[PDB]
Write a protein that binds this ligand. Structure first.
Ligand code: SF4
Ligand code: SF4
Ligand code: SF4
Ligand code: SF4
Lengths: 869, 86, 869, 86
C-alpha cells in the first residue's frame, strides 16, 4: 500500500489544483529598470546586476504549511516575460489591448498549437485577467506595465537583433518560409537555456558568503591581468565581479524570504505553524550566507539555485539532475545525527514535487502548447554509476521514488539511469512506481548515454569519469556532467552536476514528413498555397531520386535554420549571457569564463532536432513498395491521393487528430485501394526488414548530415530525436502521408515508438526494429509504450514490467517510458475533464495533467497501442 | 481596502490568494474581496514616499534614486531597499 | 639654394600662421547621437556606425588655393572631445562655466604641464572663446553642447568605467598615488591609438566600393557561421557588417567634400581657383567610390584614411609611414604618362605638409602640453629595405624631402631608415635637409629596428619580410609593418604599411629620477608632503641596497600601473574598438577580427615608457661615487642637499628650468662642496666607464624587468625610451637630483642624449657611451645633438653631417636627430616670441614652432650642448 | 546675418574664417561680422524643418527621425542626410 501523502502536502495540493497559471511583471520590471540604469556597464556585470535585482526586488511568497519555500514569482504557478529575449508573441497583443483594437492574428506555429484549456491554464481572458500567449493569466492592470517594460527592446531584443543579422544570411527568405510553414517548430532564442543539467556544487560546497570570498580572492588575483591570454585573460576579472553581483543577488533574495517567514511567524496563532514559519526563517536566513548544514537547508539551497536559473531566461528542461546523489551526504548525516527521520525527508521530497510541478515557462504558445504542453521538464535522474564506476544508487534515491509514489505530480519526472550494476531492490522500487501509470520513472540506458558522451564530447576530452556523471537535460537530452568533491560531514563525496550549456538548441524540430511532402509537391506547400522551397522540377522517377531530393531539401533547411539560430544564440551569449548558471556551471568559475565564452566544460551541445521520424520512415516504405518496387501506383497517384486525404474528411474539419476517427466522403472509394496499400505497406516496429532497412539507412544518413554543420560554439551538430508534444503542431501542418496517416493528424510520437496502430507484432518486435542501429550514434531515442493496468498487477506485475525494460535496455535501447492506463479512462476524461482533475498521463518525456493537455495530443495518447500482456 | 492590498495576503494567482490569518482562499476582485478590520497595508510603490505622479494606469515616478525612473503602483515593495511608507 | 614654395603653399601658410587651435562639437555631437540611437546594436556595428556618422555628418571645409583637402573638423587646426573615452579634464570646467562658478583646479599632471601660449594655442579664454585644457579654443555657445554631449558618459566612459574596475585591483591606492605625484605621466586611455603606423593598403587597392563589395561577399560567406571557432567565429560576420558601415561612412565623407567643392566652384569668379575647386570635386567624388587612378587621388585617399583614424580616437603618433613607397606606383605612372610633372608633385607634397602639420590632438594638458608640446607625430619614414631586401628608396622620396625643404613645417617629421643599401645621393639629399636645422629628417637605424622587430615579435612569427616593412610609430616607437601587393598600372608592387596596434601604450612615462628621490626620502614625496610608496624603512647602507630599493619601487609602480592600464585599454578595446583602423590594419579584414580582438598581425606592441634615464644614471653615479665609494659624504648629507636644492633658488620660484642659471642663494655655500662633487661625478656620455657601467646595468635590468609583465593582449612588455616633452613636467615634480640637476628643472632630454652640459668629451664620446649595450634590446633609444650652423657650412658640411650620422648608426645606435641653430637665437626668441613666428626647433622626436613650446622645454632646448665642429 | 551664418563662409578657427567670394578673412563676432548682400544662408540645424523648440543655448529637438533627439542650432547641417531647409 502506498502511504498517504503528508498533511502539509495534501493541504498545498488542495491549493495547487485551484491555481491559475499566472504572469506578472515584478521580475521583468526590475530586470529592465536595472539593466538600463546600468547602461554602459561591462556586459557580464550589467547582466549579473539586472538578474540579481530581478530576483532580490521581487515580492517573496510563502504559503502556510510549506516547509520548502520559494517560487519563480510572487505567484505560485508564476512566470514573467523576457522582452529583452523576445516579445513579438505578446507585444502586439498588449499594445492592441492598450489601443482597444482587435488583437493581431497569431503567427503560424502559435496558431497551429494547442494549449490545453483545463487545469490551471488561462487560455482565454476573463474578468480582470488577460490570457497572454494562450496560457498565462495576467491582471489587466499590469498590461500597461508589460507594454512599457517591453518598449525599450524594439529592434534590440535577442529575437529582433538576431533577426537583423539573419536577414544578411543568403538563406534568410528560405528560412522564413521554413518557419512560416512550421517545418521548423520554433526559434532557439525562445529558450536559450535548458535541455541541460544544473550543477548545484558551488553553493552546496561554499554557501554564498563563501562564494563572494572566492570572488574577492580571484578579483585580487586577476583583475587587470591577462596572463598570456589576449582573448579572454582580461575578461576573467569582469567575470568574478559579475559572479559577486549575482551571488549578492541570490543572498538578498533568500533574505527576503527569511523576512517574510519572520513576519508570518509573528501573526500566526497556531503554535505548530508558527514554529514552522520560524524554521523557514532560520533556513532561509542561513542559506542566504552560510554553507548548508542540514538536508532541509541543502535541498532548499538547490531550490534557490534552480529558481535562480529558470528566472534568468525563458527556458524549459533545466534538469535537477541526480538530486539523490548530490544530496546524499546531507541526507545521511541528518538521519545519522538525529536531525531527521526518513519520513520527514520524505515529506520534504513530497513537498519538493509541488515546487517543481509549479515551475512555468513563459513563452510563445507554439512552445508552451505546441512543444511543452506546459511541462517544464525539470528532470530528476536516478542511479547510474558514481565517480568510481560503482553503482551510484543512494538510500536517498529510494526516498525520492517513494515521494513520487505518495505525492503524484507531473514533476519532477524521474529518470532511472538503468545500469546492470543497479541493485535489484532499487530497480523493483522504481518499477513499482512506473507500474502506477504516472509515467515515471522513465527508463534510460546509462551505458548508451555514456557511450554517446564519449563519442560526442570526446574531442573536448570527455573521460570515463565525466561520462559517468551524465544524465538527461530536459526530457531525454543527454547532457554532460562531471563530479566535484563536496566536503561535508568530515568527508569528501564526488557529486554529479551538469557541465554543458543547452543540449536542446540549434536547429529545432524539423517536420521530416512535411519535407517529404514538399518533395512530392515540388516545394509548394499545398496546405497553404505558399511556395516554401524553390521547385526542384525533378521527375520523381525512382525511390533514390525522391530520397535524394528529400535530403537536398533537408540539408538546405538545416543550413539556413542553423545559420539563423547560431546568430540568435550568439547574440544571446554576447548580450544576454547567463549569470546564475555561469556561476554554477563548471568550469566557469575555475576558468573565469561565463557560459557565453565557453566556460562550461563541454560545449559540443548544440544540435539538430528531428520530428516525425516514423511517420517519415513509414511513408518512405509505402512509396517505395507501392510506387517504385511493385509499380502498383504512380508517384502522381500517390501524391494526388495524399493531397485529397485518401477521400476522408480532414482533422481540420473533424478535430480528431489520430487514426481513431475516419469520416468518408464522396471521394472515399476512389482512393480506397491506394489507401489500403498505404496502410498495409511494411511499417517500422514490426521487425519487418523492409521498413527497418529504411529506418537504418535514415539513421546513418542523419548522423552524417548533422555533423557537417557547425554551431556557434564551433562544434559539429548531432541528432536529438524526441517529439515532446511537437508531433501535434507539425502533424497538424502536414497533409495525409503515404503511410496512410491522414491530414492534420499527429505524427508518430517519440522517435522509435511505433506509429499508432501499426505495431501488430508485439512489443518485442518494436524493440527489435528500434535497435537495428547503435543508439549511441545519437543523443537519444525515445520510445513510448502503453500497458493496460491488468498486465502489471501485483509484485509479479512489477517484475514483469522491470523485465520488459531490461530486455530493451539490454539490446541497447536508449529509453522506454510507460503509460499504465485503461485508454477508456482517457476517452472518458476527455469527455468530462472536471471529473479527472488529478489524472496524469505520460506524453513524451513528461507527465502532464490530462486536463491541461490539448486535444490533439490527447487523441494521440488515447490511440497509442494498448498492451494487455 | 482589499485583501489583495493587505500585508497578510498570500499571493496565489491572477484571481485569488490566501489570507494568512485564516488560511482561507480570498478573491482579488468582486464579492468577498473587501478587506477586514485586521487589514494591514502591503508595501507597494503606490504607497511609497518615493513614488509620485502616477498616470491613470498607475505608472508613476520613482525618486528612490538620484536619477528618477518609472515605477508602477501595484508593484510589490516589501523587497525594495529604498521603500518608505508614505 | 632652396627653390621657393609654390604660390598655393605660400598663401595657405600665410593663413596658417594666424589660425587658432579650435575645439568644436560636430563630430562629438554626431558620434554621441548615433551611438545612443543604436543602443542595443552589436558593439562592433554600433561603434562603426557612430564613427561613420561623426565623420560623414561633419561640415566639410575647403579653403581657397588648396589642392589636397580634408581636415579633422570644419576648422583648420581643429579637434573635438571624446567624452566616451575620457572627459574629466574638461567636464568639470564646462559645468563650472554653465553654473557660473569658478572652474576647479587642474589635476597634478595637467597643472605641472605647460602649453606654449604663442602660435595658435588658446591657453586663456578671451572674447567669446573658451580655453579648453589650456590649449583649445571652443566658442562659448558650444560649451552647452559640450556639457550635454558629455553627460550620458558619466560612470561609463573608458576613463570612468575602467576606474571602477581599477579600484578593484589590490594596488589601486598605490596607483592613484603614482598618478597624483606624476611619477606616471598619464593614462593609456588618453590616447588608445597611435604610436603606430597606419596601413593605407585597402582603400588604395580596392577603393571604397570595392571594399564594400568584399564586405558583402564575406557577410554572405560567414554570417551565421562559426567554423570551428567558438570564440570569434560568429564575430566575423559582425566585423564585416561593421566594416561595410564604416566604409560607407568614409565614402559619404568624401562625397561631402565633393559637394562642397562643387559649390565653391559655382561661386568662384577667379577661373584659376575655380579650376582647383573642380579638380577637388572630381578627386573627392572619385575616391568616394573608385580605386584611386592617379597620384593626386591616391595621396588624397591616404589623407582620407589618415583623418578617418585620427578622428575615431583621441591620439597622437598615427604615423603616415613610408608614403614615398606606398605612393611610388601612383607617382611614377603620372610622371610617365605626363599627367603630372615633378614640380606639380612637389606642390601636392608641399601642400600635404600643411595638412599634416594642422592635425591636433585634443586631450588633457598633461598630454598636449606635458608630452606632445602640441605635435601629433604623424611620422613619415623614408628608405630602408623593400620586400626583396633591396634598397626601398624611391624617386618619390627625394621629392618628399624636397617638399620638406621648400615648405618648412613641423610636420610630417621625416625619418630616414638609415641602411647601408641606401644610395649616397639620397643620403646626401636627406642630410642637406637635416643640416638646415628644421630637425628633420631624423636618422634611425634600419638594422637595429629590424632586429628589435625580429626579437620582440618573433613569438608572433615576425619574419625578415615583415621586419623590413617596419618603421616609426609616433616619434620613435618602432612599429611592426608588412608588405601587401598593390596592383596598379599593370604591375604588382609590395607596399609597406603598419601591422600592429599602438606601440606606445601600457605603462606610460615613469619619472625614474623621481622614483629614486622617493627611495632616498622613504616613500614620501617631499615636494607635496604626500606619502606615495609604503615607506621601506631601510638604512641605505650600500649602493646595492639603495638600487635594490629603487628596483622594488620600480616593479611595484610597473605592476599597479600595468594592471590599471590593462583595464583601461581592455575596456576601450571591448566597448570602443577601432572602426576605421580595423578596416585598414592587416590582418583584421582577412581574419574577420578587429583590432580589439587581435585582428592586427602583431600584438606584442604594449610597453613600458621610461623617462629621465640619464638624469637617473648620472644621479646613481654621483651617489655611488660621492656617498658609497669615496665616502666623502653620507647618504643623509646627499639627501639633505637634494631636498634643499643645494641652496639654490628653485625653478618653482625662478621659472628657469635648465642649469642655465642657479640663482646663487646665500645658502648655496653651505652645499657648494657637495654640489661640486655632484656636478663633477662621472657623467654618462663621456665614455667614462664608471658612469657607463651603471648605464649598461640599467639596460639589462630594465629589459628583464619589463618582460615580466603582461599586456591586455597577453604579451610581455618591453621598454620604450623616449622623452618627448615629458622631461618637462616630470622634471618639474622632481626635486634636485644627485647629479647636480636642480629642483623643478627638466630631466635630460631623450634617452641616450647626454644630460645638459655634462658632455665634455666630444660627440663621439656620447656615441660610445650610448652603444655600450645593443639598442635592439629595446624598441628604441633617443639621441639629440645640437650643432652650430657654422659647423655644417657647405656641401662639405652636409657630408660631415652625414658622416656623423653614419658613424653612430654603424655603431648600432638607433637614432640621432639634430638642432642646427645658434642658441643665442633661441634665447632671443624666448625674450620676444612675437618676433619669431616661424622659428622651429627639434625637441624630441618632433619639430615644433618655438612660440608653441612652453618655457620649460624652451629652457631645456636652449641649454643643450652646442657643438662647433 | 553674419558671415558665420553664410554658406560662403569658409571656417578657419574659433574667432574667424574666410569669405569664399572675397577670400578675405572675416570675424565671427563683433565689428565687421555682419552678412553682406551676397549672403546665402549656410545649412544648419537652426534653419532645418526638423529642428524645433530651441532653449536659450540653442539646444533643441531634432524630429528628423521617427524617434526624437536633441540637436544644436549652430550645428552644421550641409552634410546631414535629413536636413530640410525650413
Ligand atoms: S484584509 Fe483581513 S481577511 Fe483580507 S488578507 Fe488582510 S487580514 Fe486577511
Ligand atoms: S523606492 Fe522602491 S518601493 Fe518606492 S517607488 Fe521606488 S521602486 Fe517603488
Ligand atoms: S558672401 Fe558676404 S556674408 Fe557671406 S561670407 Fe562673404 S562677406 Fe560674409
Ligand atoms: S534633420 Fe539633421 S540638420 Fe535637421 S535638425 Fe535634425 S540633425 Fe539637424
Amino acid at each position: 500500500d502506498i502511504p498517504e501523502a503528508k498533511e502539509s502536502t495534501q493541504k498545498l495540493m488542495d491549493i495547487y489544483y485551484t491555481l491559475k497559471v499566472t504572469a506578472d511583471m515584478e521580475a521583468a520590471y526590475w530586470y529592465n529598470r536595472t539593466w538600463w540604469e546600468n547602461d554602459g556597464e561591462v556586459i557580464e556585470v550589467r547582466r549579473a546586476k539586472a538578474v540579481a535585482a530581478s530576483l532580490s526586488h521581487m515580492t517573496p511568497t510563502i504559503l502556510p504549511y510549506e516547509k520548502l519555500v520559494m517560487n519563480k514569482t510572487k505567484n505560485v504557478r508564476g512566470a514573467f516575460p523576457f522582452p529583452w529575449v523576445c516579445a513579438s508573441f505578446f507585444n502586439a497583443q498588449a499594445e492592441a489591448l492598450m489601443n482597444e483594437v482587435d488583437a493581431p492574428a497569431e503567427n503560424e506555429a502559435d496558431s497551429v498549437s494547442v494549449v490545453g484549456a483545463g487545469g490551471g491554464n488561462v487560455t482565454e481572458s476573463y474578468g480582470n485577467v488577460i490570457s497572454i500567449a494562450k496560457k498565462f493569466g495576467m491582471r489587466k492592470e499590469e498590461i500597461p506595465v508589460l507594454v512599457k517594460t517591453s518598449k525599450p527592446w524594439e529592434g534590440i531584443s535577442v529575437e529582433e537583433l538576431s533577426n537583423k543579422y539573419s536577414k544578411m544570411t543568403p538563406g534568410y527568405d528560405q528560412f522564413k518560409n521554413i518557419m512560416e510553414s512550421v517545418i521548423c517548430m520554433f526559434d532557439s532564442f525562445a529558450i536559450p537555456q535548458g535541455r541541460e543539467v544544473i550543477n548545484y556544487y558551488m553553493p552546496l560546497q561554499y554557501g554564498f558568503d563563501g562564494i563572494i570570498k572566492l570572488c574577492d580572492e580571484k578579483i585580487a588575483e586577476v583583475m587587470g591581468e591577462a596572463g598570456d591570454d589576449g582573448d579572454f585573460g582580461m575578461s576573467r576579472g569582469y567575470y568574478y565581479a559579475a559572479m559577486k553581483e549575482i551571488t549578492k543577488g541570490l543572498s538578498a533574495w533568500c533574505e527576503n524570504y527569511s523576512k517574510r517567514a519572520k513576519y508570518l511567524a509573528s501573526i500566526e496563532t497556531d503554535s505548530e505553524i508558527k514554529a514552522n514559519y520560524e524554521k523557514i526563517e532560520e533556513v532561509m536566513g542561513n542559506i542566504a550566507h552560510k554553507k548548508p548544514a542540514n538536508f532541509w537547508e541543502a535541498i532548499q539551497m538547490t531550490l534557490c539555485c534552480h529558481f535562480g536559473v529558470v528566472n534568468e531566461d525563458p527556458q524549459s528542461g533545466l534538469s535537477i539532475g541526480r538530486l539523490g546523489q548530490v544530496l546524499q551526504p546531507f541526507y545521511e548525516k541528518d538521519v545519522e545525527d538525529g536531525i531527521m527521520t526518513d519520513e520527514e525527508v520524505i515529506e520534504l521530497l513530497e513537498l519538493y514535487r509541488i515546487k517543481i510541478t509549479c515551475i512555468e515557462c513563459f513563452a510563445s504558445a507554439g512552445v508552451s502548447g505546441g512543444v511543452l504542453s506546459g511541462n517544464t521538464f525539470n528532470n530528476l535522474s536516478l542511479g547510474g554509476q558514481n565517480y568510481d564506476g560503482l553503482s551510484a544508487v543512494t538510500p536517498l534515491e529510494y526516498l525520492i521514488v517513494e515521494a513520487g509514489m505518495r505525492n503524484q505530480t507531473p514533476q519532477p519526472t524521474l529518470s532511472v539511469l538503468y545500469d546492470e550494476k543497479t541493485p535489484e531492490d532499487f530497480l523493483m522500487k522504481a518499477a513499482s512506481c512506473t507500474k502506477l501509470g504516472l509515467g515515471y520513472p522513465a527508463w534510460m540506458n546509462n551505458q548508451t548515454g555514456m557511450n554517446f558522451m564519449m563519442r560526442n564530447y570526446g574531442p573536448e576530452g570527455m573521460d570515463l569519469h565525466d561520462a559517468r556523471a551524465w544524465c538527461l537535460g530536459g526530457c531525454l537530452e543527454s547532457a554532460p556532467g562531471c563530479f566535484l568533491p563536496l566536503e561535508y560531514n568530515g568527508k569528501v563525496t564526488m557529486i554529479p552536476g551538469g557541465a554543458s550549456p543547452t543540449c536542446g538548441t540549434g536547429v529545432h524540430f524539423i517536420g521530416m514528413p512535411k519535407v517529404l511532402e514538399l518533395v512530392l509537391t515540388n516545394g509548394l506547400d499545398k496546405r497553404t498555397g505558399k511556395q516554401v522551397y524553390p521547385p526542384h522540377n525533378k521527375k520523381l522517377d525512382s525511390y533514390e531520386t525522391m530520397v535524394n531530393q528529400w535530403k537536398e531539401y533537408m540539408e538546405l533547411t538545416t543550413d539556413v535554420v542553423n545559420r539563423c539560430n547560431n546568430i540568435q544564440m550568439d547574440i544571446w551569449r554576447k548580450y544576454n549571457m547567463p549569470a546564475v548558471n555561469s556561476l554554477l556551471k563548471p568550469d566557469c568559475f575555475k576558468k573565469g569564463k561565463h557560459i557565453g565564452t565557453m566556460g562550461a566544460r563541454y560545449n559540443s551541445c548544440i544540435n539538430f532536432e528531428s520530428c516525425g521520424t516514423i511517420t517519415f520512415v513509414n511513408s518512405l516504405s509505402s512509396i517505395k513498395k507501392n510506387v517504385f518496387d511493385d509499380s502498383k501506383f504512380t508517384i502522381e497517384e500517390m501524391t494526388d491521393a495524399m493531397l485529397n486525404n485518401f477521400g476522408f474528411k480532414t482533422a481540420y474539419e473533424t478535430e480528431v487528430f489520430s487514426p481513431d476517427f475516419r469520416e468518408s466522403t464522396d471521394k472515399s472509394t476512389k482512393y480506397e485501394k491506394i489507401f489500403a496499400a498505404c496502410v498495409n505497406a511494411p511499417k517500422y516496429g514490426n521487425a519487418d526488414k523492409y521498413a527497418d532497412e529504411i529506418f537504418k539507412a535514415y539513421h546513418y544518413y542523419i548522423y552524417d548530415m548533422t555533423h557537417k554543420f557547425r554551431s556557434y560554439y564551433g562544434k559539429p551538430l548531432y541528432l536529438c530525436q524526441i517529439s515532446v508534444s511537437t508531433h501535434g503542431p507539425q502533424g497538424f501542418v502536414t497533409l495525409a502521408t503515404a503511410d496512410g496517416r491522414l491530414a492534420g493528424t499527429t505524427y508518430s510520437d517519440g522517435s522509435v515508438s511505433a506509429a499508432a496502430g501499426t505495431d501488430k507484432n508485439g512489443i518485442y518486435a518494436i524493440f527489435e526494429s528500434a535497435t537495428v542501429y547503435d543508439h549511441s550514434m545519437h543523443q537519444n531515442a525515445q520510445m513510448n509504450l502503453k500497458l493496460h493496468p491488468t498486465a502489471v498487477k501485483g509484485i509479479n506485475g512489477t517484475r514483469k514490467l522491470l523485465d520488459l525494460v531490461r530486455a530493451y535496455m539490454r539490446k541497447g535501447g536508449f529509453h522506454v517510458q510507460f503509460n499504465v492506463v485503461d485508454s477508456k479512462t482517457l476517452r472518458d476524461a476527455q469527455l468530462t475533464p472536471e471529473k479527472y482533475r488529478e489524472l496524469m498521463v505520460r506524453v513524451a518525456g513528461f507527465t502532464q495533467y490530462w486536463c491541461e493537455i490539448g486535444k490533439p495530443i490527447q487523441d494521440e495518447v488515447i490511440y497509442r497501442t494498448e498492451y494487455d500482456k | 481596502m482589499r485583501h489583495y492590498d493587505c500585508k497578510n495576503y498570500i499571493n496565489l494567482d491572477c484571481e485569488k490568494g490566501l489570507c494568512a490569518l485564516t488560511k482561507g482562499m480570498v478573491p482579488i476582485d468582486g464579492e468577498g474581496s473587501e478587506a477586514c478590520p485586521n487589514f494591514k497595508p502591503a508595501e507597494k510603490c503606490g504607497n511609497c514616499k518615493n513614488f509620485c505622479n502616477p498616470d491613470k494606469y498607475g505608472l508613476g515616478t520613482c525618486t528612490g534614486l538620484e536619477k528618477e525612473n518609472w515605477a508602477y503602483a501595484t508593484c510589490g515593495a516589501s523587497a525594495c531597499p529604498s521603500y518608505k511608507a508614505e
